Structure formats: structure tokens, C-alpha cells
Amino acid sequence: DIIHLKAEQRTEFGKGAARRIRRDDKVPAVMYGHDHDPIHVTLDGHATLLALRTENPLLSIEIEGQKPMLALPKDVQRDVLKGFVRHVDLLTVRRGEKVDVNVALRITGESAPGTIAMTEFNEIEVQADLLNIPEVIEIDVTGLEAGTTIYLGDLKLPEGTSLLGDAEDVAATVAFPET
Amino acid sequence: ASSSRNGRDSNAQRLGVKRFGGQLVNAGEIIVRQRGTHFHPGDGVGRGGDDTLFALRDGNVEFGTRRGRRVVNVTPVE
Amino acid sequence: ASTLTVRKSLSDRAKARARRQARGRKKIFGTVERPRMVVTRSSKHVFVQVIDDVAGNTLVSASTMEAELREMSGDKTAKAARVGTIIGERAKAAGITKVVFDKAGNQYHGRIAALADAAREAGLDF
Amino acid sequence: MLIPRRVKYRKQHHPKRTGAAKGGTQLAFGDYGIQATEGGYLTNRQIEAARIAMTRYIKRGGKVWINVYPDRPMTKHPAESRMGSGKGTPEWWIANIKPGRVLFELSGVPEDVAREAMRLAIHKLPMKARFISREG
RNA sequence: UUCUCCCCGAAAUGCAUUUAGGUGCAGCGUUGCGUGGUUCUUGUUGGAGGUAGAGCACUGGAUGGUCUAGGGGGCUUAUCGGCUUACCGAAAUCAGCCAAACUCCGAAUGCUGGCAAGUGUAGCGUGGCAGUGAGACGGCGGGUGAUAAGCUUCGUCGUCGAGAGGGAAACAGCCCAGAUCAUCAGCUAAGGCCCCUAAGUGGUGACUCAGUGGGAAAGGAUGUGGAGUUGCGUAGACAACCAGGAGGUUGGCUUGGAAGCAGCCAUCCUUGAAAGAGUGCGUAAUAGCUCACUGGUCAAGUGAUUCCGCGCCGAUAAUGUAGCG
RNA sequence: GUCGCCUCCUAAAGGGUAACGGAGGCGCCCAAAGGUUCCCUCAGCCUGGUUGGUAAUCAGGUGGUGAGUGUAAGUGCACAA
RNA sequence: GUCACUCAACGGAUAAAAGGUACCCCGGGAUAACAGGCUGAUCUUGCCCGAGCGCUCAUAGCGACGGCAUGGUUUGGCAC
RNA sequence: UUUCCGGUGGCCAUAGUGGAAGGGAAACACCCGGUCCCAUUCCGAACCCGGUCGUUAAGCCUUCCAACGCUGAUGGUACUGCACGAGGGAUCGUGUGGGAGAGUAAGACGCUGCCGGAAU
Numbered sequence A: 001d002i003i004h005l006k007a008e009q010r011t012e013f014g015k016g017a018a019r020r021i022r023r024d025d026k027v028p029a030v031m032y033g034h035d036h037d038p039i040h041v042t043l044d045g046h047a048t049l050l051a052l053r054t055e056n057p058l059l060s061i062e063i064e065g066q067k068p069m070l071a072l073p074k075d076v077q078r079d080v081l082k083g084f085v086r087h088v089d090l091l092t093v094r095r096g097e098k099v100d101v102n103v104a105l106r107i108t109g110e111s112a113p114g115t116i117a118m119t120e121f122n123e124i125e126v127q128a129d130l131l132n133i134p135e136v137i138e139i140d141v142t143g144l145e146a147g148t149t150i151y152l153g154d155l156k157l158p159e160g161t162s163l164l165g166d167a168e169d170v171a172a173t174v175a176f177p178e179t
Numbered sequence B: 001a002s003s004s005r006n007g008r009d010s011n012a013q014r015l016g017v018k019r020f021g022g023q024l025v026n027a028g029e030i031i032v033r034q035r036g037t038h039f040h041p042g043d044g045v046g047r048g049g050d051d052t053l054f055a056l057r058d059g060n061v062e063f064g065t066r067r068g069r070r071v072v073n074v075t076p077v078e
Numbered sequence C: 001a002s003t004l005t006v007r008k009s010l011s012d013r014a015k016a017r018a019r020r021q022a023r024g025r026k027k028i029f030g031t032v033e034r035p036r037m038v039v040t041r042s043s044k045h046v047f048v049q050v051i052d053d054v055a056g057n058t059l060v061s062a063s064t065m066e067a068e069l070r071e072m073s074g075d076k077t078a079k080a081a082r083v084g085t086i087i088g089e090r091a092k093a094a095g096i097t098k099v100v101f102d103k104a105g106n107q108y109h110g111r112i113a114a115l116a117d118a119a120r121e122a123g124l125d126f
Numbered sequence D: 001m002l003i004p005r006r007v008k009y010r011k012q013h014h015p016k017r018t019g020a021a022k023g024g025t026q027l028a029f030g031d032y033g034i035q036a037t038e039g040g041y042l043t044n045r046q047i048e049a050a051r052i053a054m055t056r057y058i059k060r061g062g063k064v065w066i067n068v069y070p071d072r073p074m075t076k077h078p079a080e081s082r083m084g085s086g087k088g089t090p091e092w093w094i095a096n097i098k099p100g101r102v103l104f105e106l107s108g109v110p111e112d113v114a115r116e117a118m119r120l121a122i123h124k125l126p127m128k129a130r131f132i133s134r135e136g
Numbered sequence E: 001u002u003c004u005c006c007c008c009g010a011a012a013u014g015c016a017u018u019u020a021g022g023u024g025c026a027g028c029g030u031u032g033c034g035u036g037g038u039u040c041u042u043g044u045u046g047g048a049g050g051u052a053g054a055g056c057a058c059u060g061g062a063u064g065g066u067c068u069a070g071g072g073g074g075c076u077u078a079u080c081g082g083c084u085u086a087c088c089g090a091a092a093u094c095a096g097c098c099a100a101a102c103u104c105c106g107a108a109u110g111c112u113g114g115c116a117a118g119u120g121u122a123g124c125g126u127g128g129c130a131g132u133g134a135g136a137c138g139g140c141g142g143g144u145g146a147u148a149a150g151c152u153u154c155g156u157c158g159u160c161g162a163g164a165g166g167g168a169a170a171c172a173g174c175c176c177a178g179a180u181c182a183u184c185a186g187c188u189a190a191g192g193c194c195c196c197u198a199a200g201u202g203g204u205g206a207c208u209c210a211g212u213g214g215g216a217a218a219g220g221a222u223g224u225g226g227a228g229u230u231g232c233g234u235a236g237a238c239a240a241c242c243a244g245g246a247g248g249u250u251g252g253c254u255u256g257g258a259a260g261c262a263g264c265c266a267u268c269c270u271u272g273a274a275a276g277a278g279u280g281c282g283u284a285a286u287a288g289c290u291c292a293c294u295g296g297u298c299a300a301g302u303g304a305u306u307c308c309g310c311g312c313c314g315a316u317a318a319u320g321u322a323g324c325g
Numbered sequence F: 001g002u003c004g005c006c007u008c009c010u011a012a013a014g015g016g017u018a019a020c021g022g023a024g025g026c027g028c029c030c031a032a033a034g035g036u037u038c039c040c041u042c043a044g045c046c047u048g049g050u051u052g053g054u055a056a057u058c059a060g061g062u063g064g065u066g067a068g069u070g071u072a073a074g075u076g077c078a079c080a081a
Numbered sequence G: 001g002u003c004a005c006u007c008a009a010c011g012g013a014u015a016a017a018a019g020g021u022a023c024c025c026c027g028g029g030a031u032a033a034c035a036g037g038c039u040g041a042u043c044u045u046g047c048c049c050g051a052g053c054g055c056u057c058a059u060a061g062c063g064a065c066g067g068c069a070u071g072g073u074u075u076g077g078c079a080c
Numbered sequence H: 001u002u003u004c005c006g007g008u009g010g011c012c013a014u015a016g017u018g019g020a021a022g023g024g025a026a027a028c029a030c031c032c033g034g035u036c037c038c039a040u041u042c043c044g045a046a047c048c049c050g051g052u053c054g055u056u057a058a059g060c061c062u063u064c065c066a067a068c069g070c071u072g073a074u075g076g077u078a079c080u081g082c083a084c085g086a087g088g089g090a091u092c093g094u095g096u097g098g099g100a101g102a103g104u105a106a107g108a109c110g111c112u113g114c115c116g117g118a119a120u
């Protein structure tokens, strides 16, 4: 899915300008790529928060003078206590292309009550295609107990989403309870 | 009561650069007092017994790099 | 091409010669008044150049490679002495008078010493 | 009680308690956690009380991570004594907490009882803290 | 320690001291003579750095995971060798961390040169005469101390000291502002404009109803306004009101009793438009009262949840209201 | 308890900066451990090897400073100091 | 030129020196004891959380581990 | 003049580390000897001397590989000079100037001077 965001040129730089923008309830963003100079824009705060609710969404930035262009939020600086987005790094993508992204690991398996599944990572770097971004990568540990551990080289990854990270380290662990 | 096993300290030695970059100096003028060669002697600069870098000639002091060393040179005055 | 560090994977003899050359060069440095005579003593030839280390250029040079000396029958030491005489003559021509000798990581002995004494006889002040 | 095996210097200056959390502002091991919204000093006794509360409420399941460590020693002037005669003897071990620091983490427990355990733990801490999760 | 006025105007620091409330030298004052932009401010241009921050390359500290040398416990039973290693576990490695005496990094300022402009008359040399060498509080950056003191000890700027005038109810150190004298003129600073008390019971838009304003914490609370996110809802929501609110099943370790209510659990199946081995009240122990869910007259919005503004509780000493003067 | 000297931190990236603040050293030593010239590269780790073991001496491989520096600490020093 | 000082209280009062005074005598609140003032560690009085104890039953009544404050009467700190 | 190569500097990893392929005309090198100068805290290993047969296996050289390492913006954030402001208090915020580190896109399998060589 494509999320459309209206942005306009940002020209004032520095902490004072950023504070003024955030008080105006916008959010600064820098959009860069492998073909053109970085573009400094400001986005609507509410729209940016709604768009960034999900992880790795495909955004289209529209500037009135310019043309819509496709980007991904690569680094989102959010406030720590409040959830507000403080700054956005947008990385331009060339429609038909390939990208490296992080997809969230979750556990959807059940074992004996003695052992509890644990995730060794929050995100895994997975090389996928633009139009099919895996929302979540799911691994199921059902009927497996004791001290079995799962590394990154054995996953039921969806089609077109190759693994870019190392496959010689553990990802999921099941072990007896916190004794 | 109690007491401290500390309270001793040595007198201030007043090290550091004495003539900065571009400053005009005379021959023999001390450029930097130091312990060890944080700055090595460059062109027109001699190194003394206590690692003091001083001017071997008149000119302007510059700080630079000679091969892999931080050095202090005295460029002869134009 | 100089890199401070001795290139790794270099042969053991080459590393030893490079280290000795560097430690000699630590105090040897050629100026316009007293340029640096560098003698590279290869297994078959000796190549001598007088260098102004300030500018990084060679003023005069000589070697056994010269056609006037290739067929000059003689031992390695004799050929090195002939090279030393030639380089001294060229230094006199260029008006060098005094030089500083850089053995370039080799012992001052044999061919190197013969070349140095030949230059001294030719009239170089060192 | 968490006490370091050894420290380089037993008598140290008071830790800076200015600024936001330098690092460790995000969950790294567990699913839920406690995030301090205010700075302050966190002693090993308080850490142990909170950990006991969480573990006791979650019973046997789930696992708890203590992200912070009370490795900073605090000296105490000898009692009833006039000022001076050198620094005191270490008496407390604290961790330097800054706003946004994740103190405790929990995993392997349903969200509601995890929240209740975190509430029990937070009521033992000397600074304000909140329950956080990986957005569920 | 006794008359006057005119000009300038400190110090309470450093070093040393049989010294610490003394004194010498230097610092700071004044003054004669001499030297004249050398001082200073700003801009520009160039230097050395390791603080703040940050980081984990080093040295220490540290959490979890993987893995493991090697130690512990056992047996077959041991000289081995094996099963174990379901225990311990250096190291290595992955991820998150910590540091006044850690640094792969690294500012702002400050310091110090060149140049340019601006500038009071600043700077410097050398003589005469000093006083001072008990400091105080405030801002900022630190040590001591308990996250203490109107505490103590440094760095730095300010005021006071040695400073009147305006403001702060009063109130050396805070804010405004440096008093040559006269004036029954005007404009302002901080702070103020209902009355005390000079000037607005000013205009417009919101919020508060606590006399909050006009002291306070952890914590607690259908206070009240505003901004979201989200579930359900004229397939008819939430309340209110009439019928089904139970079989098998007194489910099991308990406990003369756990039958639905001592505590702990697999957290099922059924006559069926409907229901939980079961949530409150009742109860020696079962009974029962009553709810989610099952229809209907009515039905237009409800139910969560987050954040923001102002409020509430917590709140609590002694002569007299007495924490807006 | 302290008094002179040296190193670090406090000390706020020049210098300087106090407390009965936090850590340690000094009142020597060396005729070479001084001068000069030339030569050399360590510690650790891995493998093999009489006595011999974690570790003596030897071999190969790896390894740039983590060894070393008469003596504290810092600044230095592998170009080696 | 060089020598002789733990003149170490190390800018080194004499080459040469310990005590008692409640029998005592002759500036300082620059500095202690008492009271006042500040502070509140300690003390004191509350409060939040509720492990647990209370046949059963957290909260009849109790309150572990921790947390937050009141009072200024305790011991102190400060030395106004 | 150009190309290739040997020496000798400069920048001191954008150059290193590791992997792959290929090359020697001069040159470099390994290599072959130890009689001679000389040498080993033993050893002609090294140093030195005498040769240039043999050999491109290695050094060296050329091409390729971002793989480890290295280099690295823009924007934002931390901090901060000056000027203020807010909390009972730890402490926090704003104006006006300066502004990182980390991380991100990316760069990069070196650059450059002089001398000599063989060919053109």
C-alpha cells in the first residue's frame, strides 16, 4: 500500500527552525537517494504519525511545485517519553527495485508450561521487494520444549524476501522458566 | 576520629604551548614545554633535555605533520 | 611511494633492508648544501643518486647500467668503484662539493665502501 | 543485593544527574518493561524490592531483566562527626537513572498480568516510571 | 585621634612567614616624569587542546543470549572409558549498557598570534605616598556534606562592601538604575493601573469556582474544558423492564464441608434463539438471591483509551486571623 | 593526622585554581642502567618436541603494540627511548 | 674548587629548651559550652504499595521488602 | 612523446587486511657458490664476497573482488556563549549565535614528485 504525504520546501535549518516547525506542529524530514541531492521538507505532524504507525511503509511525498516521489522512512527520530516523531529520514526508492529493511520477529507458538519461548532480536534485516513488504515475520514454536534454540538460517520467510543478516546467530530460544 | 592518607600534590609545572601557530619568534625562543614528545621537533626546531621544543632560527611557528609525527616547524621569515 | 610501515608480506630480506634503510634515513637528510647520496646495491648492479631531500628530486645519478660500463670487465667491487668515480665527476660538474652518504640499509663495506671512497677521491667532501 | 565484585575507585564524585538517558531507551531483551520518566538515583535495595515484586507476582513463568546495575558507590560521613577528616566509607550502591531509561524488562507473560507486575514494581521505585511495550 | 571643599579611588587575592586577627613582596589606588595607540571591544583569519556531549578502540565495571575450555555431582562404577553433564563455568562471541582519575572521537566558550575597523583616554616604563591582605550573598560550572544548611572550599560574572533613588509589604547582597546643584516641566526602566496607592472597577477570546490565585511530595480521584486513537450502534447500541440465567457435574490433591466461591488447575462437552466445572452477595457444608448471553415496548449515541489546559484530595502546632502586605 | 619535593584526578579542552578532597610516590639508584656506533623486535596465542609440567630451552605459524622502560604516575617511546 | 645540617616545622626564630595551674592574673561572639537561628542526617508523626499473617478472609486488626513526606521536641551538623 | 618497469621521496589505510587471475625485455628478486674482504653471542640462515646458470613458486608488478577494516555527508539531536524563563526540589524550557559523537546515503581494492631502465 502507498501512503501519500503532502510536503513543502524547508529552508530554515538549525535547532531554532526545528523548534519553530514542531511548535507549528509539523515535522522536519530529509529525503535522499542514490541519484539526486538531498531534499529538505516538512510534513504534517498528524499525517506523519498516522503513516509511521506501521513499520516500513511506502510513502509518496508530494510537493506542490515538484512531482510525487516514492520513499521509505529509514531512520525515524521519535521523542522518548512522548511518542511524537521528531525527525524523519526518507530514502528514495526507484519503483521497480529491491530494498533492505527490518521486519519484526514475533512468537506464535505454544510449548509445555515449563518452557517459554524467547526472541533474541526485535528486528531482522530482510532483503525484500518494495510492493511486498513483510509486515511481520512469524516463527512458530509448537510442541518444541527443553533447550532448543532457533538461528536465523531457518525461517519461513515469504517469497521474494531474502535474508541479508548473518545466519550464524540465534533468533528464538525456548528454555525452562525463570527458576 | 579519622584522617586522610592524601593531601600531597606537586607544584604546578606550567607546561603547554608557549608560542602558537604563526607567532614570530627569535632563535632559541621556547615554543613548547612538555613531558615526552607529544610534539616532535620539526624543521628549524630543536628538542632539549626535558623535551622542550625551542626555535633553532628566527621565523614563524607552524604546527604540522612530518611523516607520521606531529611536529613543530619554524619557517624562516620572508 | 613511501608508507612508513614496512609492507606486510614482503620477503624477510626486503623487510630487514627496509627497516635498516629507514633507521639510517632517520638522521640522514639531504639539503641543497649537503645533498643525500643514496646507493641502492642490487645483486647485480649499484644505482647511485644524489638527491635534494627538501625538493625531492635527484640532481645527478649513475649506475653500472650505463653502456660505457656494461662491458668494462672487472669485479663487482671494481665496477662499483668506477661508478663512484663517475658520480663524483658528475657531482663536481653540478657543483655539489659536499654530500651525505646514505648506505640505504646496507653495511658500509665492500662495494658500497669502494664506491664511497671512489667518490671521495673524485673530490666529494664527505 | 547487586554489589559489584570490585571497583577501580571506591570513593567517587556524585554521578551527574542532568540530561536525558544517554542510551538504553528502548527494549532490548523482553516484551514489556519499566521506563523511568524522571531522573534520580536507584539503589540496589530498591532494585531488589522491585525485582522481588515482579518475580513473585509472575510466579514461575516469564523472565525478568535488570537493565541497570548499582555500580556507583556512595560514601557516608561518619555519624555524629564534624565536617572534614576526609571522605567517608561507601555505604550505598546506586545506578544513575535518567528520563527515558528502561530499568526492568519482562517476557513470556500475558500483557495484563505483566502490567500488574510492573505496577507492583513501580510502586517500589523512588522516581516516576511507566509501563512500556513493543506496541503490543 | 578635632576645620572645609575640589579630583580620583581601592582590597578582603597570590606567595612566604614560630605564620594564620601580625608582616614582607606582588596584585589592586593615587600622584610626578617619560613613552603615545602599544590597551580594550567587534569582525575577520590562523593556531594548541580533550572539558561538555558522546562512544566502547583501550583499561576497569555490567546485563542477557549463544558457545565452551575447565571444574563439581552421580552412577556402569572408574587406571581408564562411557553415560551424563538436565549443575557451576573463565575465555571467546552477539546484543543492550556504565566511568572524576576510561577514550576510536569531540564541541561551544576561553586562551593566544596576524589583519581591519571602532574606542574611552586606555596600555607601558620609571619615581613619591598609600590602604588592603576577616569578605557577604546571587547567577552559572564543580569539590566536601545526606540530592542538608543563610554550610564549607574553589572557578567565573554581578551587586553589596564603598551605592543614595524606583521596585521587591518590611527586607546590605535580587530586579531597574549609578545621586554636580536647583525646578510646583516632560518621557520612560523594573514594577504596576478596584481601594489602601500614582495610573484601566481597559477592549477582545478562552480557562478556573479551588478564594485555586494567595506554599509542598509519593500517591489517589466519573472535577472541568480541549485534542486524538479505537470498539460497538436504528442487522439495532448502553441503561432501565418482562422469560431462558442451566443438564452430565457433589470435575478433580485438599478439608467431618469445598456441590459455584479454602487455596492451585486441563480453563471441556450438551436440550439449544442462551450461558461461565462458575465471576459478586449468601454462607457449619449444599441452598438461593443475582450478572455477562439469550427475545420484546422504548431507543440515539454509547464503551474504551491516550494526551493536553486549569483545578481536587494527600495538607498537619503551640500569644492573635497570621502562607495575597 | 599533616608540614619539603614528584605524578594523576578534582581543574570547568592554554596557564593557574582551594578543602583534615580522591589516588600514589621521593630523601635514591647505575662505571653502566652514561657517551657513541651498528644490529634486533616484543607480550600473548596455536602446533610439534628428552627430562619438562600452564609456563625453562627448541622449531614452525600467528601477532604491531596488549610486552618492555632501574624506581610512582602521567606524557612518551615499535622510526624505538 | 669542594666539604660539614631528618636546619624533614624542609624560605632554614637560639649553637643550646619539657610540663602544671581548679590559686591563677592581664583581646575575641574572628572561636567552643547554654539559649535563639538555619538545616533535618538522626529522631518524631503520618502516608503510598501490599508480600504475608490473620478458620475462610490483603486491609476486623495487623504491614515484610521498598517508597514519599510532616513536625522541629532528640542526638547532631553549621558557627549567623 | 607515450607505454611499461626498477629506485628514491611526499600524503600516511579512500593507501590497509584478505581472496582471485595474470606477468617478467631491461631491471628487481629468489637462486648458485665461498676461494678472497667480511661475518655468526652456534650456523655463508643473516651480514659480506664471487657469479647471473636456473626460476617466475614467493617478494615485486598488473587486473579484478566492498568481504573485514578505513573514509563519510545532508538533516536532526546532545551540548553550549549571551539573554531570559519555569519548578518545593532533583532539575527543566525558550530566544539569539555556534554545533557534535553516534547513525544514514555514500566513497574507496590509492594519490603524487624526481631519477633510471627497455621499447616507441
Ligand SMILES: [Mg+2]
Pocket (backbone or CB within 6 Å): B049
Ligand atoms: Mg638527555
Ligand SMILES: [Mg+2]
Pocket (backbone or CB within 6 Å): B049
Ligand atoms: Mg637530565
Ligand SMILES: [Mg+2]
Pocket (backbone or CB within 6 Å): D023
Ligand atoms: Mg548504543
Ligand SMILES: [Mg+2]
Pocket (backbone or CB within 6 Å): none
Ligand atoms: Mg568617581
Ligand SMILES: [Mg+2]
Pocket (backbone or CB within 6 Å): none
Ligand atoms: Mg560525561
Ligand SMILES: [Mg+2]
Pocket (backbone or CB within 6 Å): none
Ligand atoms: Mg601590599
Ligand SMILES: [Mg+2]
Pocket (backbone or CB within 6 Å): E133
Ligand atoms: Mg592574613
Ligand SMILES: [Mg+2]
Pocket (backbone or CB within 6 Å): none
Ligand atoms: Mg584571608
Ligand SMILES: [Mg+2]
Pocket (backbone or CB within 6 Å): none
Ligand atoms: Mg575565608
Ligand SMILES: [Mg+2]
Pocket (backbone or CB within 6 Å): none
Ligand atoms: Mg572567597
Ligand SMILES: [Mg+2]
Pocket (backbone or CB within 6 Å): none
Ligand atoms: Mg558564590
Ligand SMILES: [Mg+2]
Pocket (backbone or CB within 6 Å): none
Ligand atoms: Mg555538591
Ligand SMILES: [Mg+2]
Pocket (backbone or CB within 6 Å): none
Ligand atoms: Mg555561606
Ligand SMILES: [Mg+2]
Pocket (backbone or CB within 6 Å): none
Ligand atoms: Mg569594611
Ligand SMILES: [Mg+2]
Pocket (backbone or CB within 6 Å): E163
Ligand atoms: Mg558599588
Ligand SMILES: [Mg+2]
Pocket (backbone or CB within 6 Å): E163
Ligand atoms: Mg540601593
